[PDB]
Write a protein that holds these residues in place. Structure first.
Motif, PDB file in Angstrom:
ATOM      1  N   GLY A 133      10.685   0.921   1.471  1.00 52.19           N
ATOM      2  CA  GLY A 133      11.410   1.438   0.322  1.00 52.19           C
ATOM      3  C   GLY A 133      10.767   2.639  -0.358  1.00 52.19           C
ATOM      4  N   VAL A 134      10.119   3.484   0.443  1.00 51.55           N
ATOM      5  CA  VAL A 134       9.438   4.687  -0.029  1.00 51.55           C
ATOM      6  C   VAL A 134      10.052   5.935   0.613  1.00 51.55           C
ATOM      7  CG1 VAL A 134       7.246   3.490  -0.448  1.00 51.55           C
ATOM      8  CG2 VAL A 134       7.662   4.540   1.788  1.00 51.55           C
ATOM      9  N   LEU A 194       0.827  -1.196   0.000  1.00 52.66           N
ATOM     10  CA  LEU A 194       0.000   0.000   0.000  1.00 52.66           C
ATOM     11  C   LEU A 194       0.874   1.263   0.000  1.00 52.66           C
ATOM     12  CD1 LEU A 194      -2.714   1.385   0.148  1.00 52.66           C
ATOM     13  CD2 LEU A 194      -2.603   1.266   2.660  1.00 52.66           C
ATOM     14  N   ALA A 195       1.926   1.289   0.813  1.00 56.91           N
ATOM     15  CA  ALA A 195       2.797   2.461   0.879  1.00 56.91           C
ATOM     16  C   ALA A 195       3.353   2.806  -0.511  1.00 56.91           C
ATOM     17  CB  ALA A 195       3.931   2.224   1.880  1.00 56.91           C
ATOM     18  N   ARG A 196       3.818   1.798  -1.243  1.00 56.06           N
ATOM     19  CA  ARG A 196       4.353   2.037  -2.584  1.00 56.06           C
ATOM     20  C   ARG A 196       3.261   2.481  -3.550  1.00 56.06           C
ATOM     21  NH1 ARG A 196       7.364  -2.489  -1.038  1.00 56.06           N
ATOM     22  NH2 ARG A 196       5.875  -3.900  -2.048  1.00 56.06           N
ATOM     23  N   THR A 197       2.077   1.895  -3.414  1.00 59.36           N
ATOM     24  CA  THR A 197       0.956   2.248  -4.271  1.00 59.36           C
ATOM     25  C   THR A 197       0.569   3.721  -4.072  1.00 59.36           C
ATOM     26  OG1 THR A 197       0.114  -0.014  -4.258  1.00 59.36           O
ATOM     27  CG2 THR A 197      -1.436   1.754  -4.825  1.00 59.36           C
ATOM     28  N   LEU A 198       0.502   4.152  -2.815  1.00 57.55           N
ATOM     29  CA  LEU A 198       0.136   5.533  -2.517  1.00 57.55           C
ATOM     30  C   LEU A 198       1.198   6.513  -3.018  1.00 57.55           C
ATOM     31  CD1 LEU A 198      -1.392   5.280   1.109  1.00 57.55           C
ATOM     32  CD2 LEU A 198      -2.611   5.496  -1.068  1.00 57.55           C
ATOM     33  N   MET A 248       0.506  10.588  -3.328  1.00 58.84           N
ATOM     34  CA  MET A 248       0.061  10.960  -1.989  1.00 58.84           C
ATOM     35  C   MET A 248       1.121  11.527  -1.036  1.00 58.84           C
ATOM     36  SD  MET A 248      -3.196  10.704  -1.788  1.00 58.84           S
ATOM     37  CE  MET A 248      -4.195   9.873  -0.588  1.00 58.84           C
ATOM     38  N   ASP A 249       2.391  11.231  -1.289  1.00 65.66           N
ATOM     39  CA  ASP A 249       3.455  11.706  -0.415  1.00 65.66           C
ATOM     40  C   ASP A 249       3.620  13.221  -0.475  1.00 65.66           C
ATOM     41  OD1 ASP A 249       5.413  11.485   1.519  1.00 65.66           O
ATOM     42  OD2 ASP A 249       6.943  10.677   0.168  1.00 65.66           O
TER      43      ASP A 249
END
Length: 130
Positions: free
Chosen positions: A129-130, A8-12, A17-18
């Motif tokens: 890895g974000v 999810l973190a990579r998708t966002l 979103m970041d």
């Protein structure tokens, strides 16, 4: 679909979103975790006001999406609430960006105020890895 944390973190991140409106990815992750447990199928009916929160970000049917059965609906995202129950979260993300363009920003969600505000949320993105 129930996302894995780093997935999810990579998708966002890929979806922009970041840092959107000054909101870090960790803050978005913390919200998704406590709002739905990273589950796109989550729904919660609010018997008191007859509205329903939909999807991964638990977006409400009175103000943001239209389900046709909520009194006082505004449909600010101009989206059917059905779009918020898909495995593909592109629509949920577009609508979540709309929610935070209002002055309250991420404070619009009680879950964020209760579980994320003024806390260390770095844990949510560690090792992704974000």
């Amino acid at each position: 679909k129930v996302f894995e944390r780093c997935e999810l973190a990579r998708t966002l991140k890929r979806l922009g979103m970041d840092g959107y409106r000054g909101i870090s990815l960790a803050n978005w992750m913390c919200l998704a975790k406590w709002a739905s447990g990273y589950n796109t199928r989550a729904t919660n009916y609010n018997a008191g006001d007859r509205s329903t929160d939909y999807g991964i970000f638990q977006i409400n049917s009175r103000y943001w999406c239209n389900d046709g059965k909520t009194p006082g609906a505004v449909n600010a995202c101009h989206l059917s609430c059905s779009a918020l129950l898909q495995d593909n979260i592109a629509d949920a993300v577009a609508c979540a960006k709309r929610v935070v363009r209002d002055p309250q920003g991420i404070r619009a969600w009680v879950a964020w105020r209760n579980r994320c505000q003024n806390r260390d949320v770095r844990q949510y993105v560690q090792g992704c890895g974000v």
